[PDB]
Amino acid sequence: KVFGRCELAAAMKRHGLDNYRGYSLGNWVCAAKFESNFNTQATNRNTDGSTDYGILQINSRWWCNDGRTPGSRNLCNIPCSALLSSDITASVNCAKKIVSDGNGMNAWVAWRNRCKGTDVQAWIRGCR
Ligand code: NA
Ligand code: NA
Ligand SMILES: [Pt+2]
Ligand SMILES: [Pt+2]
Ligand SMILES: [Pt+2]
């Protein structure tokens, strides 16, 4: 599924991301836009043997298990295929685990580079 910005905002907000650990909703929407272009099925297979999965491009070394990545920690306790679902719940829950495990949103490179310090509210502006 490829989400709209406002549909993704509403789905994220139902799952508690607005103001999660002091990161407003727009931050989360902005991160998804620049990680995956709102596509739940996005994958990026890396040269280090790891893969980035789903709408938030969560990586298979530390966070989810794809069975083929060296160094697997599986800290979200999920198969990476769960992060390719058309509903976002597993991705959102894993993203909250990532922040709970001592990370800011800096853990997402596209957040750092494309959202940090910008008018992130644009990504929710005009939405119900
Ligand atoms: Na994801
Ligand atoms: Na892992
Ligand atoms: Pt829901
Ligand atoms: Pt939830
Ligand atoms: Pt839900």
Query: What are the residue boundaries of the structural domains of the chain, listed by start?
Result: 1-128
Spatial separation of the C-alpha atoms in residues 85 and 27, rounded to whole Å: 21
Q: Could you give the 3-state DSSP secondary structure of residue 59?
A: strand
32 Cα: distance to centroid of ligand 3 (angstroms): 17
Write down the catalytic residue from 7, 18, 35, 119: 35
Hey, what CATH topology would domain 1-128 get? Lysozyme (1.10.530)
Is residue 52 part of the annotated active site? The answer reads yes
Nearest Cα residue to 31 out of 50, 61, 52: 52
Experimental technique behind these coordinates: X-ray
Q: Could you give the 3-state DSSP secondary structure of residue 36?
A: helix
Q: Which residues, at least 6 apart from 37, have a Cβ–Cβ distance to it below 8 Å?
A: 2
- Residues making up the annotated binding site for substrate are 101
For residue 50 the two structure tokens come to 């790891």
6 Cα: distance to centroid of ligand 2 (angstroms): 31
